[PDB]
Design a protein around this ligand. Structure first.
Ligand SMILES: CCCCCCCCCCCCCCCCCC(=O)OC[C@H](COP(=O)(O)OCCN)OC(=O)CCCCCCCCCCCCCCCCC
Ligand SMILES: CCCCCCCCCCCCCCCCCC(=O)OC[C@H](COP(=O)(O)OCCN)OC(=O)CCCCCCCCCCCCCCCCC
Ligand SMILES: CCCCCCCCCCCCO[C@@H]1O[C@H](CO)[C@@H](O[C@H]2O[C@H](CO)[C@@H](O)[C@H](O)[C@H]2O)[C@H](O)[C@H]1O
Ligand SMILES: CCCCCCCCCCCCO[C@@H]1O[C@H](CO)[C@@H](O[C@H]2O[C@H](CO)[C@@H](O)[C@H](O)[C@H]2O)[C@H](O)[C@H]1O
Ligand SMILES: CCCCCCCCCCCCO[C@@H]1O[C@H](CO)[C@@H](O[C@H]2O[C@H](CO)[C@@H](O)[C@H](O)[C@H]2O)[C@H](O)[C@H]1O
Ligand SMILES: CCCCCCCCCCCCO[C@@H]1O[C@H](CO)[C@@H](O[C@H]2O[C@H](CO)[C@@H](O)[C@H](O)[C@H]2O)[C@H](O)[C@H]1O
Ligand SMILES: *C(=O)CCCCCCCCCCCCC
Lengths: 121, 108, 103, 459, 84, 155, 67, 171, 61, 79, 61
């Protein structure tokens, strides 16, 4: 909701475009920015036959859960801790995307302020 | 708001202004119509109730109907001709130029 | 708006006939004259034999000796392999995954 | 082909020398034996056609049409013997002789190598067909139906003769095997435009092409049952078979010459399907249904693709059984109520439960339910015409909807609803009639198990 | 399964719950106009309750003719094929 | 059936109108042919363009499913007006009002969907990130060519 | 039959139909209560939703304006 | 064809049925039904028949505006959900004539009784045709009404298809 | 494989058997509906086996 | 055969048909069909549940069973 | 009309690129939609083929 009101019914120049993010260099404001580390290898995700959309930075927790689910059959109520670990990693992954949006929004506001400073000067 | 009749939705009989003014002439015509109906009904019934009859009771009204009924010509052909001809000229032009994709097309 | 005396008499006469006709549609005692848990399991047991066991015998024989003897007739999705599995055909062991960062 | 020609000829002395009360038993029994032996024609090879002699050959196109022809003779005998029961014995034997002579000309027509021989036999079928309609039709306007049928044919067939004789002079031969190797391209010129039309218009009239079709409903409404059966199932396919053969020597001129006929066919199939929704004569409705189905065959032949030719072959066989069955169903009602008016006798499922099932099956094949060979043929044509031009799918799809609508409308009108009160002579279906219906539908549905034998040479 | 007596019992039962009819004067042969003093509006409402009692419609052309309980019993018996 | 009982040519004189009305079992006052064109109606009566659904369902029709009596002249388009096909019965809402309300409703919805496409809803997040150069090899990319690296960072 | 129709009165009921209905109505409510006790987050939310305004400019990497 | 009295009474019934479709609840319907009746009782004694026709015409205009778009229909009435549901099971009695003798042998009592009815029909027919000739004026019937039988042993003319019609629930 | 593929086809073949018996080979009109219902109930059981194998290991073919 | 209950027991008093008859009397009218409807408000039809009560059918025993179940599960989990 | 509306929701799920969710709704929907029809059939049968809800009511007990 609210972020949509600001863009469509407000100033869209300081609002992220969800189809073009990010529009600033990844290291702009972040001296020494680490890379995201991938645990599962390409071969492991291939052998597990993960759906392509599941082959993301949480795939190792999914691979652990799927193996548990097979090993616990017929007990289909087990593997509940393994499932939560995958669901939790996805939650943190989603929060990281929220931060990228918030970073983009504030950098677009800083740029707007830096343009009234020059338009005054 | 008055009823507006349409071809596919008739005026209701209770709303028809000629249903409440019925004169002697209109009553006479209705009696003449009922008499025609009754005469045909009797003629039909004397055969339909005849215990010796086996078959079909031929209806001259049905025969007249089928006889009467058993008794926009280049424009769509021209229209469709130009639609398909224009489409196939466009398609043929692209194949000769190589601009039409037929990578896996080997059934025709 | 009631019936006229002739309408009443015709209806009465038809009514008598209709009821006599309807009465005559009743069958007689001899009609129709016709020409000359163990039970649960047995009925269920014979049903399983004829409708499951015999069909599966036929299908299995058909799949085993006619269908699977031709290339690519029954194609399986190959089994998923997870880190830590052991392959039955070769004895190969799939290495574990890298150790996880704590979460 | 003498193993089929001679025993067919011998059916004539069989019929004339039979005991008076055995004419239908003997002719039916022995015509069924000829039909059985016709399956020896299935010895088809992947490359070469089955070339018996200098006069006759059989490829995968002619073989299914031959089998259908010889299967149809006993069915016509079964279908005819009731309404001919009061006929005197000599005139019965003459009627059976016309049917036998029709089979003789037909099997020779489908197997001739040389095109003039095909022409003479193709023309000879007119005589017994005309005689069957004008002599043994019931109504006054059978005489006009004969003249329309006779003169529509000869209006197209005489130019064909001139073209055929012209082609032999130029090429040196009309043997179809020779034409396959000596064929030369047809260049653009007004002379070749009329050669093309002369080579094709006779077959267009037979199919019949939309706009040259009005003879067909006239003929069906007047013909006796056997006349309609052979006309719908085989005689229309003479034009389809003729086009499939003669298009060999018409390339590349067919490229642009086909357009006006494709337009007539593509639009005509919608027009005739819609007309079926308002037909009041059951036989006339089935006649218009044939026009719509044969419009697909004409399109298939004209666009000349391997898929379209296979669909055309399957459609021709499938339509022949289906349409013949519908006339037989329509005739079974007629032999009770003595009227072809579709709305006269309603709710017949209440009175004739098993004949309702035959009606249902005939309707389902008429609307091309998968996987009947009716759908296989239609689907292959629809596949191929989409490649010819994608917009054709719109007209093809619309025609499918209308065909389902009139096919089921036929079924709902005659079999469902309430029965007509005064029609009290609807006697139980005879064994002869049930056998007749089943002898159409069973082989038609069995062909679903092995469609390849009806897909023709391009298979 | 309806019976001639069963239909008659329910026709009178409905009429005996109608305040404009005195249940003491009511018999199967009471004319709704001449014996009970009802009007044709009343007659229409009686037919409507009968339709509600037995759950089927009596067309206006037939309904206007039913002027006593027995004629209603006869009409219902004839449409339901009750012969006993 | 004789020829004099069958449909004939369009009636010219008033004495042919009376004969035509009698042939079709109609009052000559009611009888009225179709307009004299080349259309081919002859003298077949032009009857009201109403569905059979509009006839009294309680009357004892000789054909109850069609609501026709034996011998009465049949509408030229009877086969279109049977109860399974075209209905012309009065509607509780006027025909023109119905068309406006239905067209207005569809048109309004189509316009709003266009608006919904131009201003879509979404959540305030950045793109979903994938490893190994956005799964270059998994999506079918050429093994021999080297993809232009995609690098994701922690935030 | 074993249940006989009545006139203008509440119908005759069997004891089986009443008990079976009550059992399955009570089963439905036990199941809802049991599931809600164990899986209320399925209805209420599995994780906390952060407030982006509470994030600091330092962690988002927003440099100071005069720079 | 309909009298003024018939048109008013038809409207009252039609109006009450649509009012019930609106009210649904019996207590609510009873209340508004009595109000509706009082609107008809108001003009019950209008002797000016031009005024009476105006009252009915406006009443029918009022009904058309206020009718229920989906009124209740009895299930077996025309337009109801069970209308004609059982027609497929109605089989005309002449069909038994074509039964095979082995089928008829399964019901010897029924088919002997059927023969008596067929004999009653055959022996009555001439008197029925004669009665209708004697009672029909020169021009032919002016209405569809049929007469009763007038003597003893006569049957009302044209009775067979009424008396022997299919049962409403034939199977 | 062999149990999975055989039982998945048995589910389909079992459903057609009441239709084939309409050709009067071994037909009990007295309670055909019970016969049809029993086949549906048995087909449900036979289909639960390949479903269980799929849920276990994801077997598909 | 089938015995009909005595017709005189059907009285409008104590039912909402009595309320209707009081609102008509204020207008000078009377409902003459009231007793034909009275059976619908009497006997085993007199009191029906509300919408909330219908949705809560079975709640009492479903709750009692649930309390026993979490009590049992809390006891075992403590072991 | 409830089925049509539920079908529309399934189509919406396809439109948001959630095919497996759309499939789960087919399965879950089957149980209670078929039950609702069987309950309506129970009512209709007990009310002698009445289907108008304006003539039902008071069936809870
Ligand atoms: C009269 C209409 C005749 C059309 C004219 C055909 C003609 O005469 O063309 C002459 C040409 C022979 O000329 P040639 O010297 O051999 O070769 C060089 C080509 N200029 O001939 C040819 O090359 C081709 C001859 C083909 C034979 C044509 C047969 C008659 C064509 C007209 C009928 C076609 C339409 C059919 C309508 C059927 C109606 C139902
Ligand atoms: C594309 C190609 C389109 C081809 C359309 C073929 C047109 C065929 C029209 C029917 C032809 C006549 C056959 C007999 C059908 C008929 O007349 O029956 C009428 C029937 C009435 O049914 P009912 O309303 O329930 O009333 C019955 C109670 N008296 O009602 C019917 O059954 C007929 C109703 C169907 C009318 C056609 C309307 C189709 C919808 C078109 C608009 C939708 C646009 C396309 C879909 C958009 C997808 C996003
Ligand atoms: C010398 C050169 C000529 C060679 C001729 C060779 C054939 C000679 C045939 C001579 C025998 C003809 O036989 C004579 O005609 C027919 C059929 O045969 C028979 O009569 C026929 O009547 C009817 C048909 O109408 C049938 O029952 C059956 O076909 C036969 O009985 C006569 O009872 C018989 O007397
Ligand atoms: C239902 C019936 C459908 C009928 C469809 C009719 C299709 C009409 C096709 C028109 C093309 C006819 O064929 C056309 O004939 C002329 C003959 O002069 C040829 O042209 C030839 O004559 C012209 C003279 O005008 C010269 O300019 C040209 O150099 C020469 O080659 C064309 O090369 C050929 O294209
Ligand atoms: C969440 C739901 C989202 C979808 C909601 C869609 C609602 C949109 C409704 C648009 C259709 C309105 O259609 C409009 O109605 C009015 C009122 O009758 C019509 O108005 C007309 O009819 C009325 C009544 O007869 C008269 O005032 C007069 O004849 C004329 O004004 C318009 O001719 C029509 O164009
Ligand atoms: C996996 C376990 C799931 C939970 C299992 C819970 C067990 C369920 C036990 C249900 C048995 C209840 O038994 C049923 O209770 C209700 C209580 O109103 C009784 O109902 C009683 O009160 C109601 C009025 O409110 C009336 O029906 C009547 O006065 C009386 O019968 C039923 O007559 C009785 O048959
Ligand atoms: C915030 O995350 C947005 C979630 C979407 C809420 C639904 C709003 C619906 C408004 C109607 C749109 C009108 C057409 C543009």
């Amino acid at each position: 909701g609210a972020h949509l009101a600001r863009r469509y019914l407000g100033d869209a120049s300081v609002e992220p475009d969800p189809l073009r993010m990010p529009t600033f260099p990844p290291d702009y404001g972040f001296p020494e920015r680490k890379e995201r580390e991938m645990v599962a290898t390409q071969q492991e995700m291939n052998d597990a036959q993960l759906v392509l959309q599941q082959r993301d930075y949480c795939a190792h927790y999914l691979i652990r859960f799927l193996k548990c689910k097979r090993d616990s059959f017929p007990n289909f109520l087990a593997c509940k801790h393994e499932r939560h670990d995958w669901d939790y990693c996805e939650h943190l992954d989603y929060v990281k995307r929220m931060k990228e949006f918030e970073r983009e929004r504030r950098l677009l506001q800083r740029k707007k302020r830096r343009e009234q400073r020059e338009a005054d000067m | 708001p008055k009823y507006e009749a349409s071809r596919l939705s008739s005026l209701p009989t209770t709303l028809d202004p000629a249903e409440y003014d019925i004169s002697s002439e209109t009553r006479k015509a209705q009696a003449e119509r009922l008499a025609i109906r009754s005469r045909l009904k009797r003629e039909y019934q004397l055969q339909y109730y005849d215990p010796s009859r086996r078959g079909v009771i031929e209806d001259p009204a049905l025969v007249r109907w089928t006889y009467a009924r058993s008794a926009f010509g280049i424009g769509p052909l021209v229209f469709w001709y130009y639609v398909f001809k224009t489409d196939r000229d466009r398609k043929e032009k692209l194949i000769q130029e190589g601009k039409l994709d037929r990578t896996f097309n080997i059934s025709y | 708006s009631g019936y006229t005396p002739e309408e009443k008499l015709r209806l009465q006469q038809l009514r008598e006939l209709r009821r006599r006709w309807l009465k005559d549609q009743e069958l007689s005692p001899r009609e129709p004259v016709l020409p000359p848990v163990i039970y649960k399991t047995y009925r269920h047991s014979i049903f399983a034999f004829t409708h499951v066991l015999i069909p599966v015998w036929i299908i299995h024989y058909y799949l085993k000796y006619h269908v699977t003897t031709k290339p690519y007739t029954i194609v399986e999705k190959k089994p998923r392999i997870f880190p830590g599995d052991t392959i039955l055909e070769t004895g190969e062991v799939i290495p574990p995954m890298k150790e996880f960062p704590d979460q | 082909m003498l193993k089929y020609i001679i025993p067919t000829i011998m059916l004539m002395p069989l019929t004339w020398l039979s005991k008076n009360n055995m004419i239908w038993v003997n002719s039916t029994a022995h015509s069924l034996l000829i039909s059985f032996t016709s399956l020896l024609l299935m010895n088809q090879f992947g490359d070469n056609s089955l070339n018996f002699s200098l006069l006759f050959f059989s490829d995968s196109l002619s073989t299914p049409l031959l089998i259908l022809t010889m299967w149809l003779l006993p069915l016509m005998l079964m279908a005819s013997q009731h309404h001919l029961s009061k006929e005197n014995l000599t005139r019965k034997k003459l009627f059976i002789t016309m049917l036998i002579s029709l089979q003789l000309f037909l099997i020779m027509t489908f197997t001739a190598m040389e095109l003039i021989l095909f022409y003479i036999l193709f023309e000879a079928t007119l005589v017994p067909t005309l005689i069957i309609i004008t002599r043994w039709g019931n109504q006054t306007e059978r005489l006009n139906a004969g003249l329309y049928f006779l003169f529509y044919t000869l209006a197209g067939s005489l130019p064909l003769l001139v073209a055929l004789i012209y082609i032999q002079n130029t090429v040196g031969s009309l043997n179809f095997l020779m034409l396959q190797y000596w064929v030369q391209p047809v260049h653009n010129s007004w002379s070749n435009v009329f050669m093309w039309l002369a080579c094709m218009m006779a077959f267009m009239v037979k199919m019949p092409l939309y706009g040259l079709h009005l003879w067909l409903p006239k003929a069906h409404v007047e013909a006796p049952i056997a006349g309609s059966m052979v006309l719908a199932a085989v005689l229309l396919k003479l034009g389809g078979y003729g086009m499939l053969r003669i298009t060999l020597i018409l390339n590349p001129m067919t490229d642009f010459m086909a357009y006006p006929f494709i337009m007539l066919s593509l639009w005509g199939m919608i027009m005739t399907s819609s007309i079926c929704l308002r037909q009041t004569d059951l036989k006339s409705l089935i006649a218009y249904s044939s026009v719509s189905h044969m419009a697909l065959v004409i399109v298939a032949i004209l666009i000349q693709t391997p898929w379209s030719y296979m669909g055309a072959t399957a459609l021709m066989i499938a339509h022949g059984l289906t349409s013949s069955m519908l006339f037989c169903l329509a005739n079974s009602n007629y032999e009770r109520i003595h009227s072809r008016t579709m709305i006269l006798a309603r709710g017949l499922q209440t009175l004739l439960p098993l004949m309702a099932t035959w009606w249902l099956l005939a309707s389902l094949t008429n609307l091309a339910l998968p996987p009947t060979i009716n759908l296989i043929g239609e689907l292959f044509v629809v596949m191929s015409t989409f490649s010819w031009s994608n917009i054709t799918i719109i007209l093809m799809g619309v025609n499918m909807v209308i065909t389902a609508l009139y096919s089921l409308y036929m079924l709902i009108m005659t079999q469902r609803g309430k029965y007509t009160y005064h029609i009290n002579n609807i006697s139980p279906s005879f064994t002869r009639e049930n056998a007749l219906m089943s002898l159409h539908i069973l082989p038609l549905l069995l062909l679903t198990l092995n469609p390849k034998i009806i897909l023709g040479p391009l298979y | 399964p309806l019976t001639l007596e069963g239909i008659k019992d329910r026709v009178l039962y409905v009429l005996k719950l109608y305040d404009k009819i005195d249940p003491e004067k009511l018999s199967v042969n009471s004319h709704f106009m001449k014996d009970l003093g009802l009007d044709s509006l009343d007659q229409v409402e009686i037919i409507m309750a009968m339709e509600d009692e037995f759950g089927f419609e009596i067309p206006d052309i037939d309904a206007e003719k039913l002027m006593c309980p027995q004629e209603i019993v006869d009409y219902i018996a004839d449409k339901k094929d009750v012969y006993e | 059936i004789t020829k004099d009982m069958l449909p004939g040519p369009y009636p010219k004189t008033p004495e042919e109108r009376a004969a035509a009305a009698k042939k079709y079992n109609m009052r000559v006052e009611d009888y009225e042919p179709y307009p004299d064109d080349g259309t081919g109606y002859g003298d077949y009566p032009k009857l009201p363009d109403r569905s059979q659904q509009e006839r009294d369902p309680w009357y004892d029709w000789d054909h109850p499913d069609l609501r026709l009596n034996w011998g009465e002249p049949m509408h030229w388009d009877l086969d279109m007006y049977i109860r399974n096909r075209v209905d012309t019965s009065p509607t509780p809402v006027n025909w023109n009002l119905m068309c406006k309300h239905l067209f207005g409703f569809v048109a309004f919805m189509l316009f709003m969907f266009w608006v919904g496409e131009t201003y879509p809803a979404y959540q305030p997040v950045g793109p979903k990130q994938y490893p190994y150069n956005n799964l270059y090899l998994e999506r079918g990319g050429d093994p021999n060519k080297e993809p232009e690296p995609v690098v994701h960072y922690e935030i | 039959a074993h249940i006989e129709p009545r006139y203008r009165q509440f119908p005759q009921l069997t004891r089986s139909q009443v008990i079976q209905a009550e059992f399955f109505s009570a089963t439905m409510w036990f199941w809802i209560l049991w599931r809600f006790w164990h899986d209320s987050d399925a209805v209420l939310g599995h994780f906390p939703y952060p407030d982006p305004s509470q994030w600091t400019d330092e962690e988002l990497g927003i440099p100071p304006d005069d720079e | 064809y309909l009298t003024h009295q018939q048109k008013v009474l038809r409207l009252y019934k039609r109006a009450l049925r649509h009012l019930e479709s609106w009210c649904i609840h019996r207590d609510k319907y009873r209340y508004f039904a009595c109000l509706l009746r009082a609107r008809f009782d108001e003009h019950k004694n209008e002797k000016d028949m031009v005024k009476a026709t105006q009252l009915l015409r406006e009443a029918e205009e009022e009904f058309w505006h206020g009718q229920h778009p989906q009124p209740y229909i009895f299930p077996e009435s025309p337009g109801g959900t069970s209308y004609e549901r059982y027609e497929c099971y109605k089989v005309p009695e002449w069909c038994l004539d074509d039964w095979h003798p082995s089928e008829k042998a399964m019901y010897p009592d029924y088919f002997a009784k059927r023969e008596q009815w067929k004999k009653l029909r055959r022996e009555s027919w001439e008197r029925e045709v004669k009665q209708l000739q004697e009672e029909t004026p020169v021009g032919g019937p002016r209405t569809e009404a049929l007469p009763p039988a007038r003597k003893q042993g006569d049957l009302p003319p044209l009775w067979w298809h009424i008396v022997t019609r299919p049962r409403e629930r034939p199977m | 494989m062999n149990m999975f593929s055989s039982l998945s086809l048995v589910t389909l073949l079992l459903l057609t058997m009441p239709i084939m018996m309409m050709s009067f080979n071994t037909y009990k009109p007295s309670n055909y509906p019970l016969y049809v219902k029993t086949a549906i109930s048995y087909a449900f059981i036979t289909s639960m086996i390949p479903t269980m194998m799929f849920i276990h290991s994801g077997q598909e073919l | 055969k089938m015995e009909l209950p005595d017709y005189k027991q059907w009285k409008i008093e104590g039912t909402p048909l009595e309320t209707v008859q009081e609102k008509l009397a204020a207008r000078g009218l009377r409902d003459p069909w009231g007793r034909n409807e009275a059976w619908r408000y009497m006997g085993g039809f007199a009191n029906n549940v509300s919408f909330v009560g219908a949705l809560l059918k079975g709640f009492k025993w479903g709750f009692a069973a649930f309390v026993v179940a979490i009590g049992a599960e809390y006891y075992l989990e403590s072991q | 009309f409830s089925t049509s509306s539920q079908l529309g929701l399934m189509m919406v799920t396809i439109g948001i690129n959630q095919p497996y969710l759309a499939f789960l709704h087919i399965c879950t929907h089957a149980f209670f939609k078929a039950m609702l029809f069987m309950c309506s059939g129970s009512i209709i049968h007990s009310l002698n083929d009445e289907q108008d809800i304006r003539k039902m009511g008071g069936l809870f007990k």
